[PDB]
Design a protein around this nucleic acid. Sequence first.
DNA 1: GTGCTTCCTGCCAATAACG
DNA 2: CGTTATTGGCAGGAAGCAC
Length: 116
Amino acid sequence: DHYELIVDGRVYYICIVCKRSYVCLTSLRRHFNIHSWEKKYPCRYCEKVFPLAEYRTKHEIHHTGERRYQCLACGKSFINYQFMSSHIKSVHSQDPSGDSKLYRLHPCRSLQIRQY
DNA sequence: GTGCTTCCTGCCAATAACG
DNA sequence: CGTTATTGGCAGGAAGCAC
Ligand SMILES: [Zn+2]
Ligand SMILES: [Zn+2]
Ligand SMILES: [Zn+2]
């Protein structure tokens, strides 16, 4: 539940509770579950419950210890983008953020997500 | 001010629902 | 079963937090 804000040509969708704005309605619905708790996303490994599916997935990867992000310069693997990127910038003085091609994201094998 | 941890949201492929 | 709707993984910047 939202209202629309049209500014010179562009449409925005504004959340009725907290006023955040979204370029698409799908994002607003996804976000709104933080207010409504209509859907629940429980960790299958512990007691934590998450308002978004992606948050639970990232959390469950912490539990298994799977390292999907691999630096292609030296072979070292990392649990997420942030560690992969911080390693490449400090050790290799390169930005994985383009254009290059400096890391590999492996498929998730330690549990079953959608692939991709 | 450093660095770890978790969150956020546009984009769109994968999957599900629907009649 | 073909076709319209939903789900959620990804990048990479932002925010939150302990030191
Ligand atoms: Zn909101
Ligand atoms: Zn857990
Ligand atoms: Zn490296």
